[PDB]
Design a protein around this ligand. Structure first.
Ligand SMILES: [Mg+2]
Ligand SMILES: [Mg+2]
Ligand SMILES: [Mg+2]
Ligand SMILES: [Mg+2]
Ligand SMILES: [Mg+2]
Ligand SMILES: [Mg+2]
Ligand SMILES: [Mg+2]
Ligand SMILES: [Mg+2]
Ligand SMILES: [Mg+2]
Ligand SMILES: [Mg+2]
Ligand SMILES: [Mg+2]
Ligand SMILES: [Mg+2]
Ligand SMILES: [Mg+2]
Ligand SMILES: [Mg+2]
Ligand SMILES: [Mg+2]
Ligand SMILES: [Mg+2]
Ligand SMILES: [Mg+2]
Ligand SMILES: [Mg+2]
Ligand SMILES: [Mg+2]
Ligand SMILES: [Mg+2]
Ligand SMILES: [Mg+2]
Ligand SMILES: [Mg+2]
Ligand SMILES: [Mg+2]
Ligand SMILES: [Mg+2]
Ligand SMILES: [Mg+2]
Ligand SMILES: [Mg+2]
Ligand SMILES: [Mg+2]
Ligand SMILES: [Mg+2]
Ligand SMILES: [Mg+2]
Ligand SMILES: [Mg+2]
Ligand SMILES: [Mg+2]
Ligand SMILES: [Mg+2]
Ligand SMILES: [Mg+2]
Ligand SMILES: [Mg+2]
Ligand SMILES: [Mg+2]
Ligand SMILES: [Mg+2]
Ligand SMILES: [Mg+2]
Ligand SMILES: [Mg+2]
Ligand SMILES: [Mg+2]
Ligand SMILES: [Mg+2]
Ligand SMILES: [Mg+2]
Ligand SMILES: [Mg+2]
Ligand SMILES: [Mg+2]
Ligand SMILES: [Mg+2]
Ligand SMILES: [Mg+2]
Ligand SMILES: [Mg+2]
Ligand SMILES: [Mg+2]
Ligand SMILES: [Mg+2]
Ligand SMILES: [Mg+2]
Ligand SMILES: [Mg+2]
Ligand SMILES: [Mg+2]
Ligand SMILES: [Mg+2]
Ligand SMILES: [Mg+2]
Ligand SMILES: [Mg+2]
Ligand SMILES: [Mg+2]
Ligand SMILES: [Mg+2]
Ligand SMILES: [Mg+2]
Ligand SMILES: [Mg+2]
Ligand SMILES: [Mg+2]
Ligand SMILES: [Mg+2]
Ligand SMILES: [Mg+2]
Ligand SMILES: [Mg+2]
Ligand SMILES: [Mg+2]
Ligand SMILES: [Mg+2]
Ligand SMILES: [Mg+2]
Ligand SMILES: [Mg+2]
Ligand SMILES: [Mg+2]
Ligand SMILES: [Mg+2]
Lengths: 130, 252
RNA sequence: GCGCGACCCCAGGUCAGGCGGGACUACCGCUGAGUUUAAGCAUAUAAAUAAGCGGAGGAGAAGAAACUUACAAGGAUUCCCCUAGUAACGGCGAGCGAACCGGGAGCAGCCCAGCUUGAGAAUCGGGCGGCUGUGCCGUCCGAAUUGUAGUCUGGAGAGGCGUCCUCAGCGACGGACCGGGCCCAAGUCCCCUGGAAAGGGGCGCCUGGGAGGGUGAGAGCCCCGUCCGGCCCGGACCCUGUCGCCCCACGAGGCGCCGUCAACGAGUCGGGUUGUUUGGGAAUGCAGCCCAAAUCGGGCGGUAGACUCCGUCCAAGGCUAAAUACAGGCGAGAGACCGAUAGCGAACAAGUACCGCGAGGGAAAGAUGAAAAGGACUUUGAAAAGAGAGUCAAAGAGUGCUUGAAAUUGCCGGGAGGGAAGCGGAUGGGGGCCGGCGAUGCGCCCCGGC
RNA sequence: UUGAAACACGGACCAAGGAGUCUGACAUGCGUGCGAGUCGACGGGUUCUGAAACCUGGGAUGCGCAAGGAAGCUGACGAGCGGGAGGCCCUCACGGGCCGCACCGCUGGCCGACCCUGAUCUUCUGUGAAGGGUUCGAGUUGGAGCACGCCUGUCGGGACCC
RNA sequence: UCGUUCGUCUGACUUGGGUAUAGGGGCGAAAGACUAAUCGAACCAUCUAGUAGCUGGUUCCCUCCGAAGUUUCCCUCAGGA
RNA sequence: UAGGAGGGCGCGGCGGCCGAUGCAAAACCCGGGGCGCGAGCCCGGGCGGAGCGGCCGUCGGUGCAGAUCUUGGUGGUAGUAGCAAAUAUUCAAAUGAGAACUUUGAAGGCCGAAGAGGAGAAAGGUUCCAUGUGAACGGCACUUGCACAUGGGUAAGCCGAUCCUAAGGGAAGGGGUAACCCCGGCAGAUAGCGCGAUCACGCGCAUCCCCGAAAGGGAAUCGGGUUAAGAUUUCCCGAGCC
RNA sequence: CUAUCCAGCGAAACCACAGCCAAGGGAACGGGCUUGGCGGAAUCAGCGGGGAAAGAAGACCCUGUUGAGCUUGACUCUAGU
RNA sequence: CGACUCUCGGCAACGGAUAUCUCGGCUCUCGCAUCGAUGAAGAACGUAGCGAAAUGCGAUACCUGGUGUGAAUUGCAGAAUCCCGUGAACCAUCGAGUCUUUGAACGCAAGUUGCGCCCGAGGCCAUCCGGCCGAGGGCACGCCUGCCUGGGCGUCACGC
């Protein structure tokens, strides 16, 4: 249990530090767990989601629906993926927000820096597996 | 405890002064000026919205109390003496129905383990994993205003493993278990040995600790103990079996 | 018709520099009340405080005895404990009140002026130039003999002597403290309710990680983290750890011998008187005024005084960490604290709207939902809106929208009323309501199987 | 308020807020620890959830164990009676005897103030065998206290609220 | 403040602006008048939650016991020991 | 009664124990059924849609009908008192869903020029002008507005300020003050030096700084046009002046 | 011109609960008690007997071991001179 | 029967209590020492494609530069090569920059954007190879060390 005497263990301060996060902190808060085969591939559990990732929802009323990420919208703590839409009363289509911890990244947008990121995370996990 | 008290200057950051008699209103200090709803509203009272409280708490209450050092020692000895009873350990709520013998002792090879998988493996041999399970399945969110002051979760209490050999590693193994505590035997703590003020925390001794209890506490002998100025309290009856008193030949 | 040197003093938008103001927690200095207590009040107390006026730092102030003690004596400053609500002081009334001793925290001593280069200002600054750049060097100007430097500070010291003993720097790699970043165990497996599973049931796993937060409901295992630490970067470093090259002296210090020197701070101490202050009492400090020093000498030993002896220290110049404080500033952590009439006045565009000429005074105001999915369209309407319709689990959750009390009001049904109504004790008549409101079982006995 | 339905004052109604608390010293009562001791309270060591806990020092810190005096100073030389709980002995028992705590009452001794007193001894102003006292002490001839907690009371603090 | 009625109106007259005096102070052909609806001592903030022997309030139930207006002293009689 | 003590009920936490909870928690409502002498407690029904109890120990900002109690809300009062000075309005038309209140026209009256007219100083701050308008406001009403929204608008060598001084204010040197602050004629190499001259130097230095008036003193402007709103003299044409 | 009625609009003071009286008692002058009288929905406009009507913690008076303004031959001081 | 008054019960209002919360407060504890003439605190005015306030920032004006991170901002609209990279971002962070009028505030003032003096990059014509418009920059007060220019029979010497 907590031993570092510089990290907070208070509800008030944790909620503050969470809801008042900048963009660079919300990036890392906006992580999802890689799917099964993709975890076997990269030996990492979770990764901050991107613009052009293909996710598959798992817990909303939209389970088992797959789609590319089209909008990661850090201000409402939501994402919008392709076609995951509902219809307004007047008939327009609007995306519904899926919280990033309630999806899995089915396909991963391997940018060069995402490649280096997965290298560092995987070696970190394997230095404690070994 | 940490001292709590309202700020000294509360209720007195307004410069209100009473209207006195002759204004068809009460004589209580009232806020001056105009332009806001505030004008005419009473201040400085305990009775008024926006005043002090009666006898505002102050930091110099008696948060800590003192007890005679010998009375702490008496209390901790009578905390130990009550655990060696299965009936009071049960009445205090612990699940002891497969535990082999009281007061329960394990070998010192327990001291060498490292992981909590090993710790649960150890508690399977003893009869106390039922108690650890009670502690773990009782965990819940603390009802009331406690669930928002950084005290979300409560639980029950489990076996207090007592070791004697300093620097070993079970202290870090039994930690993650809810309800389960670890205490060195040199410094037994009353908050562990009798939670809630109730007698009989279910204690699990290792052999190393158990064989140095008597070198710590001593006997009915002056200077027996490791603790200066203390001999074990003697009771007001050597044998409190009213059965044999009221039913022995001499009385009857 | 002179040229001069010094002294004092000018003006310089001269070269280069230093000062003012701000915040208030804590710290230093001056100034300085009264309400209150005294059951009135006038000294006293409130109080050597609040207010006022100034000065700094991260702490400030204090600080190496002109001290206490009367002991077998101790040995700078500061704070905690006890001394001690004691000695004292006080219309000896209300009241007020320290110190030495002892126990702890921490501990550290120093440097000037004087008699002391006179074969010789050996000292310092500024300009200019060079470099190895917090400096050092070369040269010019200047300050300074009304004394810069050097030795010395009372524990001494200056000398003379002495076998003797002690002296310098620069690299290198780190260690330590500081900040920052990156990473780091384990189910989102099957069934049900549900808008949603974070809930129930089954089967599993992590745990040096069951602190905490997030996520559509009680989430160890979905996410961030937490435990263990790992990796990289950057600072200050001048604390110490080990290695290398350079080897420390006739100068200084120490130790010992000597006896001759042996300088120590002036309108300062001290005294009188006056005001304040104090626990300080024939006067504790401080201040004004007047008196006004000493060198076989000066200050103290808590009763003024003369004398004899004793103990004690050496002022009138300066610096000095730690131990201590901290309602302010920046960064943090917790809480048997308040939960929107509470807690700051302010959870919110709060010292905000607003008031006053001005000093200043100073509020009310938090929550739809999981997601705005915020009510398309038809119809009536001048429009606001209504009635259908739609969204959602729900809208009767409908933009001040979680739940929605009471006083108060409307409609619907009932009850009763000759200048009050309400209340208590009787039942009577109306309603509304209760099946644990009220039972059907016990033994003997005959089968027919159980 | 001696007397309220009062031609005595407050009160239109509802909701929420609203008034003997906290601290230092003391006191009695009670509980607990130890008990001629008791306190570990300021510090130190330890403490792997800890502002907690545990250990340590005191051979003199506070209170107590010794009081009287204003001060110099001196400082308890060992208790009897009456009544009494309860225990024990005698009697067949009624009744008697003995030991008799606490407590109440009584009478004394011892220490100190003040007075009184003087054999002896000594450093010549000290000691004090003997004997004292219509006086005095918050004494002694009973060791009972230290620490924490709580209620009531007192007092100072805003101090029950306005 | 309004209405009719009134005093004075070349005068020690009426008035704008600038300026002077700011609290035990100012100014006063004098009424203790005026000094921002405040004046026999303004307003503001602070000491300050000033003090009161005086008035008002002082919040839940049952149980049991349950009085005093009297002595004595006090600048003491609305109070206290 | 005053007052005292004992046993209990209730509120909010803390250390323990026992559990309830989306098959519906808390809270709140009821002509529901009970338990207790009583504080209160238990259950049912309903709304409500997420947390909550009971017991032992322990604690505290714990129990309301009053305080001309504080804050907030709501009644009767009550559709009541009342909307009354400044002479006054009327008829057609038009727009508009709707006309006493708007606009036009005809009429009738009032201010009667020390005016209820035309301009300013102060003070206000965009109220000025246009287009439109669901609410609110305009103490009745509105198509309307000084209300609300969106835009527009203020032109100077000649008008001012600026310049000068008055009452009077601030100040350098100096004197006081513990310091903030207070004194300005106290006379000090006075704050400023000035004037001819530089192709430089000579002469003088009085009574010696700054501020202070949009009513005092004052370099200079008139006429005719013009915009939804600017100007008389700010723009435009002409004619001048310093 | 109001007041009155109408359309529009629309407050506040005050209010324990309310509102018929005679006599008695009572805190010595009752709307409520006791004894009698009597007593019939609902409303309209007034009026000024009562509600010891409202306004204001009486200013007169007294108590205060509360103050304040002012005076003097009060007590104690102080600037000035 | 009906109206009124009182009332009981159901629903609807009025109203914002109660319950559940909480990026807030309060209290305690801890770590460091860092404002200003090199212009501070405070005040003012500006500043966004569509902003008034709050929050930033200063005519480079909700920012520029660096560095780190590594794909957004987001109420809407728009340029987006901004994509295996000299690289998005109301991102983090800090070294390079800018920092209007003010303010101790400093030329003199101040209900004034009032009124002065000095220097001067550049350019015009030549009343000369000088004058005019300048962009920028200066001018406070007391003081310290030095220097320059001076005054006084204050003390002197040496001289006409
Ligand atoms: Mg009234
Ligand atoms: Mg408050
Ligand atoms: Mg008094
Ligand atoms: Mg008094
Ligand atoms: Mg008095
Ligand atoms: Mg004093
Ligand atoms: Mg002060
Ligand atoms: Mg110092
Ligand atoms: Mg004592
Ligand atoms: Mg599940
Ligand atoms: Mg959670
Ligand atoms: Mg994880
Ligand atoms: Mg992780
Ligand atoms: Mg003084
Ligand atoms: Mg004196
Ligand atoms: Mg004196
Ligand atoms: Mg010093
Ligand atoms: Mg509030
Ligand atoms: Mg519903
Ligand atoms: Mg809802
Ligand atoms: Mg909800
Ligand atoms: Mg609601
Ligand atoms: Mg109701
Ligand atoms: Mg009816
Ligand atoms: Mg009845
Ligand atoms: Mg009945
Ligand atoms: Mg009477
Ligand atoms: Mg009467
Ligand atoms: Mg009366
Ligand atoms: Mg009264
Ligand atoms: Mg009343
Ligand atoms: Mg209440
Ligand atoms: Mg002792
Ligand atoms: Mg006896
Ligand atoms: Mg006796
Ligand atoms: Mg008290
Ligand atoms: Mg008149
Ligand atoms: Mg005039
Ligand atoms: Mg005039
Ligand atoms: Mg007046
Ligand atoms: Mg009070
Ligand atoms: Mg008061
Ligand atoms: Mg009494
Ligand atoms: Mg209370
Ligand atoms: Mg509380
Ligand atoms: Mg009430
Ligand atoms: Mg009417
Ligand atoms: Mg009228
Ligand atoms: Mg005229
Ligand atoms: Mg006019
Ligand atoms: Mg109207
Ligand atoms: Mg107009
Ligand atoms: Mg002028
Ligand atoms: Mg003029
Ligand atoms: Mg003029
Ligand atoms: Mg009407
Ligand atoms: Mg009558
Ligand atoms: Mg009556
Ligand atoms: Mg009638
Ligand atoms: Mg009538
Ligand atoms: Mg009338
Ligand atoms: Mg009448
Ligand atoms: Mg009356
Ligand atoms: Mg009345
Ligand atoms: Mg009265
Ligand atoms: Mg009296
Ligand atoms: Mg008088
Ligand atoms: Mg006299």
């Amino acid at each position: 249990m907590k031993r570092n005497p510089r990290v907070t263990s208070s509800r008030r301060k944790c909620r503050k530090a969470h809801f008042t996060a900048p963009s660079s902190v919300r990036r890392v808060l906006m992580s999802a767990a890689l799917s099964s085969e993709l975890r076997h591939k990269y030996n990492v559990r979770s990764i901050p989601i991107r613009k052009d990732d293909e996710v598959q929802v798992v817990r909303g009323t939209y389970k088992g629906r797959e789609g590319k990420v089209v909008q990661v919208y850090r201000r409402r703590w939501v994402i919008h993926v392709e076609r995951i839409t509902r219809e307004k009363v007047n008939g327009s289509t609007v995306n519904v927000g899926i919280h990033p911890s309630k999806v899995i990244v089915t396909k991963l947008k391997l940018d060069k820096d995402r490649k280096a990121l997965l290298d560092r995370k995987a070696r970190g996990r394997a230095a404690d597996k070994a | 405890r940490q001292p709590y008290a309202v700020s000294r200057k509360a209720g007195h950051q307004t410069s209100a002064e009473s209207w006195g008699t002759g204004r068809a209103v009460s004589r209580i200090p009232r806020v001056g000026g105009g332009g806001t709803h505030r004008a005419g509203q009473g201040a400085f009272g305990n009775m008024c919205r926006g005043g002090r409280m009666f006898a505002p708490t102050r930091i110099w209450r008696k948060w800590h109390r003192r007890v005679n050092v010998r009375l702490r020692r008496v209390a901790v000895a009578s905390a130990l003496a009550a655990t060696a009873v299965p009936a009071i350990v049960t009445a205090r709520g612990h699940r002891i129905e497969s535990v082999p013998e009281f007061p329960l002792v394990v070998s010192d090879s327990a001291e060498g383990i490292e992981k909590t998988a090993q710790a649960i493996k150890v508690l399977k041999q003893l009869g106390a994993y039922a108690d650890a399970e009670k502690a773990k399945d009782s965990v819940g969110i603390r009802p009331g205003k406690g669930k928002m002051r950084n005290r979300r979760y409560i639980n029950r209490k489990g076996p207090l493993i007592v070791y004697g050999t300093e620097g070993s590693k079970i202290v870090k193994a039994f930690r993650n278990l809810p309800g389960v505590d670890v205490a060195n035997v040199e410094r037994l703590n009353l908050l562990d040995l009798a939670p809630g003020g109730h007698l009989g925390r279910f204690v699990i001794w290792t052999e190393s600790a158990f064989k140095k209890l008597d070198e710590v506490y001593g006997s009915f002998e002056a200077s027996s103990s490791k603790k200066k100025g203390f001999v074990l309290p003697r009771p007001k009856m050597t044998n409190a079996d009213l059965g044999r008193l009221i039913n022995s030949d001499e009385v009857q």
